[PDB]
Amino acid sequence: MRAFIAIDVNESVRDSLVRAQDYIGSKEAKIKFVERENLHITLKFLGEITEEQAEEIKNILKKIAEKYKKHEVKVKGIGVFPNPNYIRVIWAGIENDEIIREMAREIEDELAKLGFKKEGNFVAHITLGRVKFVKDKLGLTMKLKELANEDFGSFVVDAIELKKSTLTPKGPIYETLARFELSE
What is the C-alpha separation between 135 and 28, in angstroms, rounded? Predict the structure, then answer.
């Protein structure tokens, strides 16, 4: 349905971010939280693509992944988007994201050859939930400020993946179409 490219986290990180979501909870704001299996770093959103574009993209990603070496990154810090006053999305940041950034820029340049728009201004993050509305602004800002530079854990950037999300009556389901290991 809608395809995108991502980097998955590991179980240790997933567990720590889920506990952080619980700690935020729903008392200071109504938040639709990301399900545990869907916590990941998005490198590029593709939209609806044909099977032929998908095949072509899988070939390109295979070659891109083999140019980068597996490396360990730390998930650190809570960020808000678009801005502290006005909170729409709560994210976790990545420490040492430069190689991820480099990959996402290389992806955007190659897929540009296939007609996909370069979106630029990439920021490596893991979305933790989307704020429907804030109930207690002060309380929410207080809880987010305590988390601002929090060390949530580390994981090895192992592969880039091509995934897709499909809306079904029971909500969106995500699938992994292909996975491309970075160089050891």
Answer: 5
Catalytic residue, chosen from 14, 44, 125, 163, is: 125
DSSP string across 63-129: HHHTTSB-EEEEEEEEEEEE-SSSEEEEEEEEES-HHHHHHHHHHHHHHHTTTPPP------EEEEE
Q: Which residues is 73 bridged to in the sheet?
A: 155
Hey, what are 116's tokens? 């996909």
In the chain, the amino acid numbered 50 is: T
The superfamily CATH assigns to domain 2-184 is Cyclic phosphodiesterase (3.90.1140.10)
Q: Tell me the one-letter amino acid at 79.
A: G
Residue 129: closest CA among 45, 4, 44, 28: 28
Torsion of CA 32, 35, 41, 44, to 10 degrees: -70
Contacts of residue 139, Cβ cutoff 8 Å, sequence gap at least 6: 27, 28
Determination technique used: X-ray
On the CB side of 89, CA atoms within 13 Å amount to 10
71 labelled catalytic: no
Where are the chain's structural domains? 2-184
Q: Which of 4, 5, 17, 40 is catalytic?
A: 40
Residue pointed to by tokens 């990301």? 34
Pinpoint the alpha helices (H) of the chain: 11-24, 51-65, 98-112, 137-146
